């Protein structure tokens, strides 16, 4: 009876797919609840203790006093988004000094970070290093496809229409790679893309310039939707909406942005098909 401990749903769902049967698989955080501001509740270190690895997203998402004590200095902790700079695997984003968490939103760096996850079972548990690859290789395959999938799809979002407003800044890495050209890519003006009220935590105050930035960006890019999502406060995007002038309304489904709804891979199928539906584009089958 082996228990290997994964900080979120979003790790979760891949490290049960590379390990199978052969492990118990625990996750900290789930549901309804902010990632970014979680506190460790009554048995959480028990979780810990009993467990073999912690993974984690690294970034700064696991950023509560309660999970620093715990995790700096672990040796357990395997810091997904730490050991992918260490490769340069992708290009850290940031906002006014503090590191963009939302690696998981581009399948390709999402895809990297399991081949770490992969790597890092395979090295504490030898004796399942072939069950365990061989799982790697399938999630793996099945990822790159979902990236290719992905990108076809939102390519059909009419140029035009490619701006992204949500409740807060989970989706700049998503951003960046599907809603942005190579020239956007190298300029940085990819960054026009998307906005919102919020910024890479729901715990910051939201202002009434907050407000008036998003409202602005709208009728600049005469956005049409703006995109709630699952758990966090509805009430900036509510006014926002309201402070039109000019046709604006709500996307018809929520996005998810920091939790899972029913498994990760799900959950990013929704959110491209929610995102490319209502920009305009085609879901690809
Ligand atoms: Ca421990
Ligand atoms: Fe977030
Ligand atoms: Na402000
Ligand atoms: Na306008």
């Known amino acids: 009876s082996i228990y290997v401990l994964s900080m979120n749903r979003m790790i979760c769902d891949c490290v049960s797919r590379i390990t199978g049967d052969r492990v118990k698989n625990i996750v900290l955080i789930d549901g309804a609840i902010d990632p970014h501001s979680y506190e460790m509740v009554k048995g959480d270190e028990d979780r810990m203790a009993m467990s073999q690895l912690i993974f984690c997203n690294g970034l700064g998402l696991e950023h509560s006093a309660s999970l620093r004590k715990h995790l700096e200095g672990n040796p357990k902790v395997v810091d997904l988004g730490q050991r992918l700079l260490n490769k340069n695997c992708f290009d850290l984003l940031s906002e006014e000094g503090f590191p963009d968490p939302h690696i998981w939103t581009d399948m390709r760096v999402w895809g990297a970070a399991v081949k770490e996850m992969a790597a890092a079972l395979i090295q504490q548990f030898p004796q399942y290093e072939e069950d365990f690859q061989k799982n790697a290789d399938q999630i793996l395959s099945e990822m790159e496809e979902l990236d290719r999938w992905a990108a076809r799809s939102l390519s059909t979002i009419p140029e035009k229409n490619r701006y992204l407003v949500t409740g807060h800044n989970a989706f700049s890495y998503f951003t960046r790679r599907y809603l942005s050209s190579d020239a956007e890519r190298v300029s940085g003006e990819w960054r026009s893309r998307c906005i919102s009220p919020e910024g890479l935590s729901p715990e910051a105050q939201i202002s009434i310039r907050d407000i008036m930035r998003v ?55 929704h959110n491209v098909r929610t995102i490319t539906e209502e920009l305009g584009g085609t879901v690809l089958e």
């Not at 709630?228 to 900036?236: G, V």
């Not at 046709?247 to 939790?259: C, E, F, Q, T, V």
């Open 215 to 269: 409202v602005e960006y709208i009728s600049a890019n005469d956005v049409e939707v703006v995109f709630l999502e699952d758990t966090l406060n509805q009430d900036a995007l509510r006014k926002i909406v309201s402070c039109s002038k000019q046709k604006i309304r709500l996307a018809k489904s929520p996005l998810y942005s920091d939790n899972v709804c029913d498994n990760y891979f799900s959950t990013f199928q």
